[PDB]
Enzyme design. Structure first.
Site, short mmCIF file in Angstrom:
data_model
loop_
_atom_site.label_atom_id
_atom_site.label_comp_id
_atom_site.label_asym_id
_atom_site.label_seq_id
_atom_site.Cartn_x
_atom_site.Cartn_y
_atom_site.Cartn_z
N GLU A 133 -82.40 26.35 4.57
CA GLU A 133 -83.44 27.08 3.47
C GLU A 133 -84.11 27.80 3.92
O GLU A 133 -84.03 28.96 3.26
CB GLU A 133 -83.87 25.64 2.61
CG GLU A 133 -82.17 25.70 2.15
CD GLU A 133 -82.34 24.12 0.81
OE1 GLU A 133 -83.32 23.16 0.90
OE2 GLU A 133 -82.33 24.33 -0.35
N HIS A 166 -79.06 29.37 -8.23
CA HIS A 166 -78.65 30.53 -7.47
C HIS A 166 -77.39 30.70 -7.11
O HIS A 166 -76.89 32.30 -6.97
CB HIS A 166 -79.27 30.09 -5.61
CG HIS A 166 -80.99 29.50 -5.89
ND1 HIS A 166 -80.94 29.43 -4.75
CD2 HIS A 166 -81.92 29.14 -6.79
CE1 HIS A 166 -82.22 29.06 -5.22
NE2 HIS A 166 -82.92 29.35 -5.80
N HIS A 192 -88.53 24.06 -1.22
CA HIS A 192 -87.63 22.98 -1.21
C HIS A 192 -88.01 23.14 0.32
O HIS A 192 -87.39 21.77 1.05
CB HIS A 192 -86.32 24.27 -1.12
CG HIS A 192 -85.96 24.24 -2.17
ND1 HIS A 192 -84.36 24.33 -2.59
CD2 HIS A 192 -86.29 23.42 -3.54
CE1 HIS A 192 -84.17 24.85 -3.79
NE2 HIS A 192 -85.37 23.73 -3.94
N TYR A 225 -76.11 34.54 -8.00
CA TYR A 225 -75.33 35.63 -7.49
C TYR A 225 -73.73 36.12 -8.13
O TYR A 225 -73.96 37.24 -7.61
CB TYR A 225 -75.42 35.43 -5.80
CG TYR A 225 -76.39 35.37 -5.43
CD1 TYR A 225 -77.56 36.37 -5.45
CD2 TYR A 225 -77.14 34.02 -4.78
CE1 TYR A 225 -78.26 36.33 -4.95
CE2 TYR A 225 -78.14 34.29 -4.38
CZ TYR A 225 -78.90 35.06 -3.99
OH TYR A 225 -80.43 35.16 -3.52
N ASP A 281 -71.88 28.53 1.45
CA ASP A 281 -72.04 28.10 0.58
C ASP A 281 -71.94 27.76 -1.20
O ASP A 281 -72.66 27.27 -2.01
CB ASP A 281 -73.85 27.86 0.21
CG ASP A 281 -74.27 27.27 1.81
OD1 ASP A 281 -73.80 27.47 2.52
OD2 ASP A 281 -75.66 27.27 2.10
#
Ligand SMILES: [Cl-]
Lengths: 289, 290
Positions: free
Chosen positions: A157, A101, A194, A105, A67
């Site tokens: 999600e 996010h 979300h 990470y 992603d």
């Protein structure tokens, strides 16, 4: 409708979208505010075993290498078509949060001194994810295909990578890697909102375009749910090939994934297909709310 | 590769300044509910705000709430669809989300001051002139050249347009009045300054990557954008001062201030100044914008 520019700011056509956006902005966080100092000492001083280190290393490599295009489905499928102000700003706010996010990470990777590599234990999971996505043939240009794209985002999600989240949270369950646990916990808090927004938008979108909700439309969504479970099952199979996890068995992670997949189907207005009454990982329920 | 292609990996960054600016922009996150407006309410009811000052604030806030109803329109429909590079896209998406907070903040001001809705306000000719110019502008992001001009236009929209009304709203906290409203405007400009910095940097990088769009006529269209932005704020100032005077703020120095920051935005786009106002005419406003 959902697809038309707002004439005025108020009154709201979709007041729930404003309320959820306000709640989402109140949960704003930045990766630099998390204390990772104890994670570093946890990592260097042998408190994290060699096998626990491979789990963390391989999961974070999967995160940073998948992603990469942040918010792609928001920016390319939903935002171009949902022009209503309160809905569009909800979706734009969700998409911006996904960027936090990705930076979080990356900061975990760098703070733990993880080496760069292209390979990790979960390349088959990533490839299986891309194959499933290629066979779905997501078409937002039709009213029916846009509805299926919304349902798909709820599983992306709300189910995808949740098996990996339980494994990363297994450390903070016992007071270890607490900064990493905070990243995952706040990421899950975002994804829950979300999912709530995208599912509500899905239900409203089906009311506004009722002729898309046909016998096969619903069957295709149940197929999506079962494909997400099959995908998480593959992650679990690959993850336990690395060794065991203290206090966490493969079979109960598979039951938890089925449990939350039934929640997502309920949020979409469809029925459960696994009927797992209780989440077997009760130590997680506070983070899943 | 370029601004318009999807990133293969997260790192290394093709445009590291965009990540850095996004990080700084997210650290400036604020929500409308955290500003204390209680004292603005007492300022309003208990006569600390004169009848003329209430007409300035009432009309400016009505202009705000009735224009730019579609938040982030240029981000979501012009730039984000084409700038596929990850770090640039997330920057623009982060800017666009922040604009939704501004809209909620001004709506919260309206409701907290109990301002009545009506469709009429003193700046309808200014809004009509703004919409007329943009409608007879041909914003065309589908061409390589027009997308560059779209970027330059957004820099004037965010960095110049409505700054005359911002100076008027900020003039109140200078005298200990309407300070909660002052925070809203100040934090809104802090965001817009970051959006201008990012969109201008994107414009300059985009011109390097598409160098053959930068001809004489290209720059002339941008210099006209700047001069039309000054003309629009000039019409706003003329309309606003018809309501009365502002304590400590003269129309001509507001006009000089608009010409000063319009030159700042042209420099940020990499072009030359056309007004040459050396010093910021409103030293008290530059100071609160830090
Ligand atoms: Cl259709």
């Amino acid at each position: 409708s959902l697809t038309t520019f707002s004439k005025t700011y108020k009154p709201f056509n979709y007041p729930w979208a404003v309320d959820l956006t306000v709640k989402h902005e109140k949960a704003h966080w930045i990766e630099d505010e998390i204390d990772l100092s104890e994670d570093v000492t946890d990592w260097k001083n042998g408190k994290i075993t060699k096998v626990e280190k491979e789990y963390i290393t391989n999961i974070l490599r999967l995160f940073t290498q998948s992603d990469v295009a942040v918010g792609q489905n928001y920016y390319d499928q939903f935002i171009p078509l949902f022009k209503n102000n309160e809905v569009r700003n909800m979706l734009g706010s969700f998409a911006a949060r996904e960027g936090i996010h990705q930076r979080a990470y990356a900061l975990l990777n760098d703070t733990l001194g993880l080496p760069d590599s292209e390979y990790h234990a979960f390349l088959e999971y990533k490839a299986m994810t891309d194959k499933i996505d290629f066979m779905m043939d997501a078409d937002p240009t039709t009213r029916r295909g846009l509805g299926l794209c919304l349902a798909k985002t709820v599983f992306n999600e709300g189910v995808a990578l949740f098996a990996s989240f339980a494994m990363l949270l297994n450390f903070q369950r016992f007071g270890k890697m607490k900064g990493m646990g905070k990243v995952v916990e706040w990421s899950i808090r975002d994804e829950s909102m979300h999912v709530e927004g995208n599912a509500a938008l899905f239900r409203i979108y089906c009311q506004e375009n009722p002729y898309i909700v046909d016998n096969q439309f619903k069957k295709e969504i149940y197929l999506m749910a079962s494909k997400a479970v099959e995908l998480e099952d593959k992650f679990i199979e690959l993850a336990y090939e690395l060794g065991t996890i203290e206090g966490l068995k493969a079979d109960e992670v598979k039951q938890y994934i089925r449990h939350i997949t039934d929640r997502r189907l309920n949020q979409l207005g469809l029925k459960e297909i696994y009927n797992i009454e209780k989440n077997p990982l009760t130590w997680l329920e506070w983070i899943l709310n």
